[PDB]
C-alpha cells in the first residue's frame, strides 16, 4: 500500500498523478496507491502531453495486505521491488514504444494528426487500402489499429495493448513489433480460414 | 477507458 518510499512514489490521486504527468514528458511514470487493495499499488505512466495509463501492482508474498509484500507482481509477473518493476516495465515498454513508433505501420502522434494522416494517405491513394497503428486516446495503454479499404471506403479500428512483454491483441502477446506483424498475419489467415 | 479491452481481427477481406 501507500507505504512506498521510492523516488517515483506519489501519494497523489489518479487525477492528480495524471495532471502531474501532464506537466511532464511524452514518457512519464509515478507510483501511487491502487484502488483495489492494500496489497496493491499502481504506476501511472504517460504516453503523450495529455495521455496516460494506470498499471496496478500486487504486493505478493506477505501474510497480511497491511504489510509490504516481499515481491511486486505486474501483469502476472513477480519482481523484488518497485524499482525493479519500474526499470523492467518502463524500459521494456519504452523500447517496444520505440520499435512501434519507428514502424512504417505507425501513424502520427496525436488524434488530429493521425486522422489527418490516415485520411490524407487514403484520399491521395483512393484505390489503395490503408492500415496503421497509433495511440488510443479513449483507451490508454492500447494502440489503435485503423483500417480503410480506400478513400471511398468506411473506416474500421481495433486495438493492441502495450506490455513490457510485448504487444497483445485478439488473444496473444508478441514480444516485438515484428512478431506483432507476424501475429497479425497469422491471425488474418486464421480469420480468412473463416471468411 | 483505461480499463476496457476491445479489438476485432485484422479483417483481411481477401484470401490473404
UniProtKB/Swiss-Prot annotation, chain A:
Signal sequence bounds: none
SH2 domain segment(s): 7-104
Subcellular location: Nucleus; Chromosome
Family to which this protein belongs: Belongs to the SPT6 family.
Function: Histone H3-H4 chaperone that plays a role in maintenance of chromatin structure during RNA polymerase II transcription elongation thereby repressing transcription initiation from cryptic promoters. Mediates the reassembly of nucleosomes onto the promoters of at least a selected set of genes during repression; the nucleosome reassembly is essential for transcriptional repression. Essential for viability.
Protein's UniProt name: Transcription elongation factor SPT6
Included stretch of the parent chain: 1250 to 1444 of 1449
Amino acid at each position: 500500500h501507500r507505504v512506498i518510499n521510492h523516488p517515483y512514489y506519489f501519494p497523489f490521486n489518479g487525477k492528480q498523478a495524471e495532471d502531474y504527468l501532464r506537466s511532464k514528458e511524452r514518457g512519464d511514470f509515478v507510483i501511487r496507491q491502487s484502488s483495489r487493495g492494500d496489497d496493491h499499488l499502481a504506476i501511472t505512466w504517460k504516453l503523450d502531453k495529455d495521455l496516460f495509463q494506470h498499471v496496478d501492482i500486487q504486493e505478493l508474498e506477505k501474510e497480511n495486505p497491511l504489510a509490504l509484500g516481499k515481491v511486486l507482481v505486474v501483469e502476472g509477473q513477480r519482481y523484488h521491488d518497485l524499482d525493479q518493476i519500474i526499470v523492467e516495465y518502463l524500459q521494456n515498454k519504452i523500447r517496444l514504444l520505440n520499435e512501434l513508433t519507428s514502424n512504417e505501420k505507425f501513424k502520427a502522434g496525436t488524434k488530429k494528426e493521425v486522422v489527418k494522416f490516415i485520411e490524407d494517405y487514403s484520399k491521395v491513394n483512393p484505390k489503395k487500402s490503408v492500415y496503421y497503428f497509433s495511440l488510443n486516446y479513449e483507451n490508454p495503454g492500447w494502440f489503435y489499429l485503423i483500417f480503410k479499404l480506400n478513400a471511398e471506403s468506411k473506416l474500421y479500428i481495433w486495438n493492441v495493448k502495450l506490455t513490457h512483454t510485448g504487444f497483445f491483441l485478439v488473444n496473444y502477446n508478441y514480444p516485438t513489433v515484428i512478431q506483432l506483424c507476424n501475429g497479425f498475419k497469422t491471425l488474418l489467415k486464421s480469420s480468412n480460414t473463416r471468411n | 477507458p483505461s480499463y476496457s479491452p476491445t479489438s476485432p481481427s485484422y479483417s483481411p477481406t481477401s484470401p490473404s
